[PDB]
Design a protein around this nucleic acid. Structure first.
Lengths: 262, 151, 205
RNA sequence: CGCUACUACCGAUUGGAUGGUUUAGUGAGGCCCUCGGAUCGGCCCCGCCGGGGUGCCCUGGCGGAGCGCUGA
RNA sequence: UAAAGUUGCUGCAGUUAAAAAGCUCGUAGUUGGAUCUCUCUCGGCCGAAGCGUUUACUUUGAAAAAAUUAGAGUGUUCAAAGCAGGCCGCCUGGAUACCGCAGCUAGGAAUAAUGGAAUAGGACCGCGGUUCUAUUUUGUUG
RNA sequence: UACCUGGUUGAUCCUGCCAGUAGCAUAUGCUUGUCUCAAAGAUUAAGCCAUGCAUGUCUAAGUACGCACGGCCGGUACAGUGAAACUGCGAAUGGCUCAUUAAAUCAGUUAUGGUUCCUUUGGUCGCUCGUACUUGGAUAACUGUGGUAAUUCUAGAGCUAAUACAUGCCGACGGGCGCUGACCCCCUUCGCGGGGGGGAUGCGUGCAUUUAUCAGUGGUGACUCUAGAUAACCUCGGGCCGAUCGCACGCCGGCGGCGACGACCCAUUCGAACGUCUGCCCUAUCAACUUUCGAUGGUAGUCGCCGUGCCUACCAUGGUGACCACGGGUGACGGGGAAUCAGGGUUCGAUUCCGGAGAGGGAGCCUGAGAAACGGCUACCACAUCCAAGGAAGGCAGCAGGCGCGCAAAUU
C-alpha cells in the first residue's frame, strides 16, 4: 500500500538464493534492472554467499566500490544489482569470468568461463516491433533494445550479442531439434533438445524437451531458452550437462564418490 | 427497419460513409461498407453480422470489444433486456467430508449482439470474456447452439 | 471528494454494500468542465502519474474537418444546436463531445474557391469586390486550365451543404473532449448524418 | 396455602444509565469569484550626458507618479 | 480435541428406553429397469487440419511463495535445532514428496448423463443460369 | 496403541447421561540446582498518555567572498577542510495493531487487446530549413533593527549564488519532399489535338494530443495493433530537441578521452489499480429483496489514469432469490498454517510470512511517480497541554515506560 516496497524479508526471498533463516530478518532486496526480482541473483549474494570473497555486506560494498566487478562488460557498483540468466560477471583483478547459468536443481551455479567466452552472451528475444520511421526493434529477456535486427529473427529465438559493441552476432531459430534450457518451473535448469511444440491459441504454448539420456519433460513456452543449433550448445554448460538425476542415482553417485575418495 | 432509433446518430466509427460519388454511375443506394472482424479461437463470424446493418459497439464481430480470457458456456434463461440476456451456469461442488456433491448455479448477464437472432430460452450459448461492458456484464455471446428440444 | 468507486453501489442482487476502506486518492473525481463559448480560457490540472490534462473552460475556435473533401481548417465556433444527452447542454451552450455546433464556412469556402472551376452556380447578386475575382478567373496557361477542368469533372457538393454555405454557417460534430484535451475539434456533418441531425434540430424546434 | 437458598418476559411502569438510526432545516471546505486587484515588475510620454555600431541621438544605474499597454 | 459409533459420510437411533407427520396427493430436491463391439499437404510411417455429441470420471503433463509439516544428507559433545562439517588450497550439500477444490493439457471409454433420421424440413452426384475469379492479365500492362 | 472405567437395581441385561482418563491453550498455586532455544498488554479498554528516542541525507563531479580553520607570492576569480543555508532526494519503505469488514477481504486461476508507473537497465536523444566565448527579475545563508508571556512564530533593512526556469536558429544553412503557376520543348498536319521534366518573391515538414482511404513494414488466436501517407491543429495554467561542475598538461583565433547530473518519449524492472472463474462461519422466531435517492440494461456524454450507472440526461422494466436472495449475529481481518494420527473428522488461526485495513472518530486536501499520508496539513466531534487569558500547541494500534482495565503479559 502507498507506493512501492523497498524491503525483502529473508524468508520471502527466492529459495534458489540458498539463504539461511538465522542470519537476519531481511534479504537483499534486488534493485530494479534487466532481470526480474524472483529470477535474478543480487551481486551481494554472488560475491558473498557463493564466491565467499566477502564475509559481510560491507565487504561486498568495498569490493564493488573498488570498481572490480563487471557485469556484461560494464562496471556495476550496486551491490543489489540483479544479475540473471546468461549474464557475464568478469572480475579483472582476480582474472576470472563467470556466466550465470542455472544448475539442474534450479539454482544459479558458479560456472567459470574462459575470457574468450566472456565477450558474448545469448539473449532470448521477447518482442519484435517496428517504430520511429519503419525501424525494426528487438527486445530481449535482458531488457536490451537492439535496433535494425535481422528480418529472420522472430520472437522466442535467441540471439548472440558481443558485449563490447552490444550488437547481434548470430541467432538460433526456435525449432524442433535445437538445444534449449528451461528457465522457469519444475524443470528449471534442465537442458535438452526440443522435440515438439503444442500451440494453444489464447493460452500458453507447451514445448516438449528430451534429454541426452532420453528423459522427456515439458514446460510452458515462456520457460524455453534455446541454447544452440541442433544438439550442440553455443555456450559452455555447467558441471552437470543439464541432466536431472533422480534421487536414487544422486545417492548412488554420492556413495560411490565417498567410497572411491578417502 | 430503421437503425437510427436513438437521439444520436448510429454508425460504425471505422467506416466513412461520406465519400464522394458519381452521378452517372449511381442509381439508388449503392452500398454502405460494413466493418467486421474475425475473433480468434476458431469462432466463425455469423452471416448476419457481415451482411447486417445493426450498430452495436459491444458486438464481438462488428464492435470495439476484444475477446480475451475465459471461454464459458451456459443456457439462456431470460431475454428481457436490450442486447443483454441472462444465462445460467450449473455445476457440482464437492463437499469433502461427505464425499458428495451439491447442485449450484450462477447467473451471468452477458451481451448478445443482434447477429444472433431468434435465440430462444434454453439454448446453449458460448460466451467469451471481455472488458466490463456494464455494471454486471463482462461476457459476450460468441456462438448460439440450438437446444436439442427445438424445432 | 467526488468519488468514482463502485463499492458505494448496491450489489447486482440489490443488497447493500459495506465499505472496507475510506475513499482513496486514485478513486477521485473532479468537477465538470462546462466548456462554454467565449475567448479561449484553458486551465491545466495535474493528474495521476504527473501527466497533464487540459481543462478547457471557454473556447471559440476549433480545428474542424470537411471529411468528403479532406479539408480541415481552423474555424470559429458560433453556436451549439443539438445535444444527444441533455437539452440543457444546448440552452447553456457547453462544448462537449458529440454535440452539434455551428462553425464558420469561410475557410472551407475559400479552399473551395481555390478548387473552383465549376460551371455557373450561385452568382446572381454578385459581389463586385476587386482582387477577389483573381482566385476564380485569373490568368492561367493552357495546361493549368486543363488541370482545373479535370478537377471540375469530379466536383460535387450536396444541396444541404450549399444551403449551409449560403448562410455562412456549417453543422459540425465535436469529436474531441474539450474538458480533457482543451481542444474542440471535429468534422463537418455530411450525408445521412447531416440529414438525421437536421431532422433532430427541426423536431426539437 | 402465613418460612427462606429462587437474575429476565408481562412492569394501569416511561422515573434511569458508553446508547447518533434515518427524515426535515442549518452547516464545515483545496476559494477551482467568469463580479476582486492600492502593492510587485527591463519600453512605454522623462529626469538628462551612463557614452555608442556616428569628445556629434537605435543610450549600459526606471531619482520619480498618473485604475491609459502588458505580465504570475 | 480424542475418548463421542453420546451428531454417526465412514458410522447411531425412531414397537415398548427420547423418537414415524392423523392420512393422502403433490413442485423444487434426491434417486431412477434391460439394451450399442483425392476426409488430410515436400519420400507409398510425419507437424499441421479435428464439432469426434459438450461432459462427468481415471490416469498423466505444466502451474501451484517461503517458512511449517513429511522427508534425504550432516556427530549441535547428544538432542530440540541449524544448514551446514576433518583430512600432512581442493571436495561437496544447501534435496525430494505433498500443496486440497476450481482453472490449463494429454490415451482407452467401464460406469449418473447427453440419444444426431419419424409430416424426412437427413451424405454423394452432372448442371455457375445476373455474381466475387491463385485479392480478374501472364509478348512491351488493354 | 483402531483401548475404556465408576455411578440408577434386592440382584440382572439395556438405553443413557454424569464422573473418571490423555493432550493442548490461557490463568493461577506450591516448588525450583545446571545448560540450550524461546513466547510475552492479543482476549477486557482501536481506552487515556508525562518524558526520552524512533528519518534523515554530500560526492572528484549543483550552489562556499562564514578567516570557522587554514597555503606558498597577501599586485594571479575560485589552493584545500568546511559548519550554516539554498537546491536535489527520501520521508508513501519499515514498525504497530486487528477496530471495521461475510463474494467484502483473501486464496488458487486468468486478463488488462481497458490503465498509470519515481527509480534501474537498454536508453529514438545535428531527423526543426528565416547576444550561442554563456542571457535575465530574484532569494536565502551572512550582517544589522525588532515584536510577542509564550512555538522548530517570524517582520523590516543591507548583500550575494544555482542544476524553480531559455523566449538561440553564427552549426547539418546547398537542403529534400509535397503546392493558389510568369517561362519553356515534343509525336501523321499551318484548324481549339491527347500525354511528359527544371524554375521564385508566396505554404508547410517528429510515434506522447484527440476528428482520414487504397498497400492493411512487421505482429497477434483475435486490433479500431505497429509502421506509413495526405489535410490541419497544437493550450494565460507553453512543449521535447542540455546556458553547469571532476587535481593528469596532450594532438595540424580550432579540435579531442573518460565521466557526473538532467530530460521528452519507447521498452511491465518494481509495482499499483481494475476485471468476482471457483471457494467463506451461525441464523427462517429473517421469504422475498432492489427501482423521489441507479435498482438491471441500452444510447450519448461528464469525470476519471483507464473499462464500467462511476456520475448525468433520455429510453426499456428490468436485476436477485428455498441450489437460501434480502435481513440479523459473529468473543469474524483472510490465507500460509496450529492443536489427536485408526480411517473419517472436530476445533483454532489477534500473533513475526503474504494480502487487506487503521492511526482517538468522521470528513476534506497539499506535495508528490506513488498518500485521501496522520512521527503531513485543514476543519468538526470527544478528550486534553501552556497562558501574562490576547493566544498557542496536540495524537505512542512505533521502541521503552506510565495510568486504567482486568484472571491475564517484560527494561523509561
Amino acid at each position: 500500500a502507498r507506493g512501492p516496497k523497498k524491503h525483502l524479508k529473508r524468508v520471502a526471498a527466492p529459495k534458489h538464493w540458498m539463504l539461511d533463516k538465522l542470519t537476519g530478518v531481511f534479504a537483499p532486496r534486488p534493485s530494479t534492472g534487466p532481470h526480474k526480482l524472483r529470477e535474478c541473483l543480487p551481486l551481494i549474494i554472488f560475491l558473498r554467499n557463493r564466491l565467499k570473497y566477502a564475509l559481510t555486506g560491507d565487504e561486498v560494498k568495498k569490493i564493488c566500490m573498488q570498481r572490480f566487478i563487471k557485469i556484461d562488460g560494464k562496471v556495476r557498483t550496486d551491490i543489489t544489482y540483479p544479475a540473471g540468466f546468461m549474464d557475464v560477471i568478469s572480475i579483472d583483478k582476480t582474472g576470472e569470468n563467470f556466466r550465470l547459468i542455472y544448475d539442474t536443481k534450479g539454482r544459479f551455479a558458479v560456472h567459470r568461463i574462459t575470457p574468450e567466452e566472456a565477450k558474448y552472451k545469448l539473449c532470448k528475444v521477447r518482442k519484435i516491433f517496428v517504430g520511429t520511421k519503419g525501424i525494426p526493434h528487438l527486445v530481449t529477456h535482458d531488457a536490451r533494445t537492439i535496433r535494425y535486427p535481422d528480418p529472420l529473427i522472430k520472437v522466442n529465438d535467441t540471439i548472440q550479442i558481443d558485449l563490447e559493441t552490444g550488437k547481434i552476432t548470430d541467432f538460433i531459430k526456435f525449432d524442433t531439434g535445437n538445444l534449449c534450457m528451461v528457465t522457469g518451473g519444475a524443470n528449471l535448469g534442465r537442458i535438452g533438445v526440443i522435440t515438439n511444440r503444442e500451440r494453444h491459441p489464447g493460452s500458453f504454448d507447451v514445448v516438449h524437451v528430451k534429454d541426452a539420456n532420453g528423459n522427456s519433460f515439458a514446460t510452458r513456452l515462456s520457460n524455453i531458452f534455446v541454447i544452440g543449433k541442433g544438439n550442440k550448445p553455443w555456450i559452455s554448460l555447467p558441471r552437470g550437462k543439464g541432466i536431472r538425476l533422480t534421487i536414487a542415482e544422486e545417492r548412488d553417485k554420492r556413495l560411490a564418490a565417498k567410497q572411491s575418495s578417502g | 427497419a430503421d437503425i437510427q432509433t436513438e437521439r444520436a446518430y448510429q454508425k460504425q466509427p471505422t467506416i466513412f460513409q461520406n465519400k464522394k460519388r458519381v452521378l452517372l454511375g449511381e442509381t439508388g443506394k449503392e452500398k454502405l461498407p460494413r466493418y467486421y472482424k474475425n475473433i480468434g479461437l476458431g469462432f466463425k463470424t455469423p452471416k448476419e453480422a457481415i451482411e447486417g446493418t445493426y450498430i452495436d459497439k459491444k458486438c464481438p464481430f462488428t464492435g470495439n470489444v476484444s475477446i480475451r480470457g475465459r471461454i464459458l458456456s451456459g443456457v439462456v434463461t431470460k431475454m428481457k433486456m436490450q442486447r443483454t440476456i441472462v444465462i445460467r451456469r450449473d455445476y457440482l461442488h464437492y463437499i469433502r467430508k461427505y464425499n458428495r456433491f451439491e447442485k449450484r448455479h450462477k447467473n451471468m448477464s452477458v451481451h448478445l449482439s443482434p447477429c444472433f437472432r431468434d435465440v430462444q430460452i434454453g439454448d446453449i450459448v458460448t460466451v467469451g470474456e471481455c472488458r466490463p461492458l456494464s455494471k454486471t456484464v463482462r461476457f459476450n455471446v460468441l456462438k448460439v447452439t440450438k437446444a436439442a428440444g427445438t424445432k | 471528494g467526488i468519488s468514482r468507486d463502485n463499492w458505494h453501489k448496491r450489489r447486482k442482487t440489490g443488497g447493500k454494500r459495506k465499505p472496507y476502506h475510506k475513499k482513496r486518492k486514485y478513486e477521485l473525481g473532479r468537477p465538470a468542465a462546462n466548456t462554454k463559448i467565449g475567448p479561449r480560457r484553458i486551465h491545466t490540472v495535474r493528474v495521476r502519474g504527473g501527466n497533464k490534462k487540459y481543462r478547457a473552460l471557454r473556447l471559440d475556435v476549433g480545428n474542424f474537418s470537411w471529411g468528403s473533401e479532406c479539408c480541415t481548417r481552423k474555424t470559429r465556433i458560433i453556436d451549439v444546436v443539438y445535444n444527444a444527452s441533455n437539452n440543457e447542454l444546448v440552452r447553456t451552450k457547453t462544448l462537449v463531445k458529440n454535440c452539434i455546433v455551428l462553425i464558420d464556412s469561410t475557410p472551407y469556402r475559400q479552399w473551395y474557391e481555390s478548387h473552383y472551376a465549376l460551371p455557373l452556380g450561385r452568382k446572381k447578386g454578385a459581389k463586385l469586390t476587386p482582387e477577389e475575382e483573381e482566385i476564380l478567373n485569373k490568368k492561367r496557361s493552357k495546361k493549368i486550365q486543363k488541370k482545373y477542368d479535370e478537377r471540375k469533372k469530379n466536383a460535387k457538393i450536396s444541396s444541404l451543404l450549399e444551403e449551409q454555405f449560403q448562410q455562412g454557417k456549417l453543422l459540425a460534430c465535436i469529436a474531441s473532449r474539450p474538458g480533457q484535451c482543451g481542444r474542440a475539434d471535429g468534422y463537418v456533418l455530411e450525408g445521412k448524418e447531416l440529414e438525421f441531425y437536421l431532422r433532430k434540430i427541426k423536431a426539437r424546434k
